[PDB]
């Protein structure tokens, strides 16, 4: 009576969905004698649901069996019971039926060596299997097997080896997927780790001007340590502080290792932000992230044309004089070519000595006589003065 | 029987404030003799009664510099000695260099001349690692002479030097009174510095307004060989600009790609062993070029 | 009454609730049908007819012997148990950490109440490991099912003590 | 020498379609005797030549139901037997309950009456765990009678029951031809269900327009004792609303705090052992109350 | 000559900042004989910086020593050298000097038992020490010591024990801070873990109306499993879908375990969002997070007053008739009391039969005779019709 | 030439750069002043006077013997080394994983080039652990300093082979 009598076979099977499974319950002689029962008295239950009597098959007087077809439940819990003394169910044995599909051959397998970190590989898993599936990254030379890489529970589609990367030697790598229902290996790939490096982006980026011209800014940065193994290539992008999209330098112009670069054809007095990325000259691998942004300002330069210039005139409060209000408009930024420092106005009477007035405003009230004057206006920055706007203001009797 | 001389056969040397012990050259040892200063008749005395074979001076001061005469008490002129005053040698200052993988060379200058015939003994040895003592010389790692070719040039020469071994060079300044040995550790792989490339030329590249081609050759003191290449570092700078830009060209050519259009550019380059041995060379003479228009 | 006696009855009720929930969840997941037995558990020969009458050492002595047997059996499940029952953690381990803790506290209780301590009895030899995973599942039902009776009478016994001390 | 009767002393019973074997009561075993059906003179025959001590009927059909007369071939009336037809008993249906910790009770109804004197044998045992066999009875865990007090009420009574042990009750329906034993597993700790509280009253709480006080007492069949308290669950519902709200009061009182102002509320409560033993009681009679105004 | 000759003492000391430290370098006899040197020839260097000659002290002909005062550098690297043959430094021995401060007694130590997780304790660390400092949570009964809890490198101010929480038993807990420069223990605290539980917030929150009145909404939710050990208390907050701040039910009204709650005094046809939190009735511990938000809508009810009602009148195109344009305004939401289903207009001529018109708009064109009419307007929702607005429109000759 | 010969010289240059950087960083952090020695490293008795002349087995044989000694010493630092040098990881471990890998690859190189293999020489007995942390630091300088010479001549030797095969 004591200890679980009889057994269920197979012990703990795993089968594929839509396949067939036959379960056999066999009773030990001692239990069969004691309760005065046999296979015909065995009833099967799964997850508290009674299996319909029409599905049983007595294989022998000692054992009963059932056959499930087109299995569609992921976790059939099977229990075998006897109806003993009658109208009483007692547990004989039990088993858990797990179902699923075998793992698919991993495809689109790829690896990457981030400078300073060990090799990391990624692969595409196939159909969900609902079972605990182990992933092991395998790698071996024709004369040597490397330490297995066991994927983490959280990241079953990626693994990170425990050995440091060794460049310039071909390594054979592949991933092996295996679970209780089947074993399969992905296709083997062959490559030199040097072609799967993902360097860090350049750092210590600094933008420095040049007090010569206004259309050049010098970029400086510190290359990543990985330059000792591969030759770096770069991509320099630039835009105006207000632009919405980035432009790009022709790749051919930045196709080899360097630690500085001079950008030309920049707009005057415009602030620019720069960002860079780098990789091996041959393009084999994946692009690194963008570097930190850097800002800079161009040098001074002078206005490219004279400003628009006009005036208004009214009678003065002083007999014999006229009050002339000179007015002008602030140059557009692209024409101003920089911070306006101040203005200079000149006034010359026909055949008389020139007078000059520096003005920090867009209007000036002066007391003029009734004679004809020539008026000019230039604007000055650190580099020099603009050409003058010149007008003849005729005499009042004209 | 007196100390054989240093330079000429009848002159001896001394340092001021020290003790100097003159001997009468042409007198039998044991004959009493008298000493006088040239032009001054006073008979000088000495701790050994006052009449021996050797004059002694505890004075050693500047007034004692001149010509001395020794004579036996009979009046016979036994010989002449000249006292020249000086100072012990100072430690010399030593530097080495090497532009090839076979030989290297060192030079030295006195830190003090003293006024004495300051000749130099030069040697060097190959240090080992067993270190039981300073005696492991079956191949004889001892002192090897640095021959001075026209017996000047102030430089040792090493032929057939070991490229990777480390050497401790022993330069000893000597005068008639002592030594002040300079020891300088030198490894050919650490000290090496090639000469700059020669003939640096810059040329425009038609069709490309912002590329220039730089070319140069190896230095003549460096034979081109597949075992030791050199890496190169090129610098360029637009006129009036303060900061150099640096690139590291492969080979004897380099296309500059960020030259400012229409502006003279200065260019200089330096060399180092391709396996980062030794140190970088001095900068080349500046060369100027101007990008094509358009 | 006393604060130490209040606290022990309260913790047993807490453990009783934990045992009932895990026992009902387990049979819910592994529907064993039929009365399951193990030779090593004690027969709880108590009719609750008259329980006040019993004296203080016996109530505490019987709980200690029963709880020690249950503790070994809980530990036995964890060590040699089949993988089928891994689904009962961490709930099974918290119960282990709680029942062991309460049994120890009871020995402290006995010292403070100056009750005669029982003589060190000879521990029962080890239980053979289960012959299969399902044998382990049946064993799990016996321990939790058997426990949620010992603890029920533990609450009751401590409450009898509470009415006096 | 024939099977002693079941009920009255000269009547025997049988089931249709089976075989029934009648005996002549008052005749010496070995005397040949004749059998007749009441009112019909045809002499019946039997496998044993045709004249034994016992009549046999392989027929057993409805036409065979009635009164039978047996007589010896001499004409002497040896006795009378009545054949009543029926069917074996069906399995009875059994349920148990318990409102206290000492006794529990079970009831049963026939699933079929058959038309036969269907009396009942009732018993129960305490299952053990050693399980060497069904024989571990030094305290004698065997069959114990359930006495039927006025010999009806259809219920077993258990006095002095073990609170935590599990019992398998054995109710056997018996008629003169067999048994169909009902076995029902019952544990006092699982099956227990107390009666609902009585006297539930709801009262307003002046000053608080949304609180009501509910009070109630233990059921009389449950003696208040410190070892087994009861937990309670109270439900309340505003008139016309479909869903009950549930709270779990401590003790015999509960202040409801979310009663809708100015509206009749229905209230009902049920009881269970405070250690979640057994199952919840049936719901109490509904009680209505109305919160104070203001 | 071979093997490190002599030694530095003390081997590897750790001292407190602003304290004094004396270092002694002793030369082995074999080295002293070989190079023909002694203590006076020993020079000391730290981090490539030459120690000034004036700081040496010859303790004996075999050993030299230096004394640093008011030490302010965190990691003095000390090396002992001989000047051997002269003008040549060779390494004798070396040591690393580390400095800092002893750990302060941890204060404001607190623990929390999140339901379903093990006990977690937090404490305030003091001044930065710059040295690797271990934190170990200690706990013990008067008759038993519990497993030590080792803080994690990332979280040095918190530790999470490895044993499951056991409620209703007092446990003595404290944290011990120790490092190379000192050992100290925080003050001991005593508490019952049951008073440091942080239950999860209620889940499965559902808002259900009641088709009786319009000012009641019924809240339902599932309490956290922790209700088996402690009695729960709640805080119910509510606001209108457009309100910016939350209101709150009086705590006294939700001071005991429950799984439902009826909110009263709600505005008609307003959408409300609810959120709840719970804790032990006595307030001992820390409040749990807010539950998930829940939304609901109140039942229908009818307008509380008649709408404003007026009209415009113009000549009709049919001789003898007048075109009357009745117009009205949509009730304000707080007065509409719900979705407007439709309108009903009635028209009654003096001593004549009433006409009714259902209108789904805010204007109606009708052809009326020249007699006087009474016009009424009611609005209807699921519950009923509003009171009518009534006006006398006088005859055209009035 | 051959691709296998190109690859080995390239990896040595990579390892040489790694060794130089770690050696300069280490002396930067622990400024040992003076020439440090260990009895177990080989004397690199090669003047680079004439190196083409030497035949193929000897160049490869000398590298293998020297590199095997350096490998043991690198391993020796990791196992019994003092805590003072924990700051040199993971840089020291990557070098170990790289130098060991290159030495193994060279044995494969020898098979493919059909060079006579040396007889299995008797391995040197274990080095005693350092007597102190600073003794370990001096030992670290010797291995990295000694290595960045062996590797320099390794690049050179492989380049000599490259001009022919
Ligand atoms: C560097 O070179 C100088 C001279 O080349 C070395 O100086 C010489 O050192 C020795 C021993 O220290 C002195 O002793 C001499 O030994 C010989 C042989 O026993 C003996 O015949 C002499 O009478 C004398 O006692 C010697 O005076 C001295 N100077 C010389 C030779 O001019 C110096 O030792 C070397 N330093 C090194 C190798 O580190
Ligand atoms: C439940 O109770 C019924 C009756 O109370 C039990 O039925 C009885 O079972 C026994 C053995 O299985 C039958 O055999 C009898 O044994 C006695 C003693 O040896 C013998 O004197 C009789 O002539 C007969 O052979 C018995 O006929 C039967 N019915 C009765 C006693 O009315 C039944 O076994 C019980 N079920 C359990 C305990 O599971
Ligand atoms: C009745 O038939 C069953 C068929 O399943 C027999 O069970 C098998 O018996 C063989 C005998 O050697 C074993 O090898 C198998 O392992 C048994 N099946 C299983 C699933 O274990 C059974 O033995 C037969 N009855 C008798 C008395 O032999
Ligand atoms: C010279 O003095 C020094 C003082 O530091 C002596 O060094 C100590 O010697 C004692 C002798 O037993 C040892 O116990 C100490 O451990 C030594 N100091 C240290 C820091 O280790 C030294 O011994 C003296 N010289 C001689 C020849 O005795
Ligand atoms: C077994 O599988 C076959 C297909 O291979 C299917 O046709 C059949 O229905 C399944 N079940 C049986 C044979 O009981
Ligand atoms: C998968 O991995 C787990 C953990 O290592 C292991 O227990 C299990 O047996 C593995 N499965 C198979 C099929 O090997
Ligand atoms: C040692 O510490 C004291 C203070 O305790 C200080 O005054 C002194 O300057 C320090 N240095 C010495 C004594 O060399
Ligand atoms: C601090 O912990 C680390 C890791 O367990 C240990 O190596 C170190 O010795 C500890 N420090 C002290 C002072 O015990």
Author numbering:
A (entry chain D), E (entry chain A): 2 to 399
B (entry chain F), D (entry chain C): 3 to 296
C (entry chain B), F (entry chain E): 14 to 178
What does the paper say about this structure?
Following the formation of the receptor complex, the Janus kinase (JAK)/signal transducer and activator of stat (STAT) and extracellular signal regulated kinase (ERK)/mitogen-activated protein kinase (MAPK) pathways are primarily activated.
To understand the molecular mechanisms underpinning human IL-11 signalling complex formation, we solved three structures of the complex containing either the cytokine binding domains of gp130 (gp130D1-D3) or the complete extracellular domains of gp130 (gp130EC) using electron cryo-microscopy (cryo-EM) and X-ray crystallography. We obtained a 3.5 Å resolution cryo-EM reconstruction of the IL-11Δ10/IL-11RαD1-D3/gp130D1-D3 complex (referred to as the gp130D1-D3 complex), and a 3.8 Å resolution cryo-EM reconstruction of the IL-11Δ10/IL-11RαD1-D3/gp130EC complex (referred to as the gp130EC complex). We considered the possibility that structural dynamics of gp130 D4-D6 contributed to the decreasing density quality with distance from the cytokine binding regions. Histograms of the distributions along each trajectory are unimodal, indicating continuous motion. This analysis shows that the D4-D6 region of gp130 is dynamic and is not stabilised upon complex formation. The affinity of the IL-11RαD1-D3/IL-11Δ10 binary complex for gp130EC, (KD 4 ± 2 nM, ΔH -20 ± 1 kJ/mol; Fig. 2Iiii) is very similar to the affinity for gp130D1-D3, indicating that the membrane-proximal (D4-D6) domains of gp130 do not contribute substantially to complex formation.
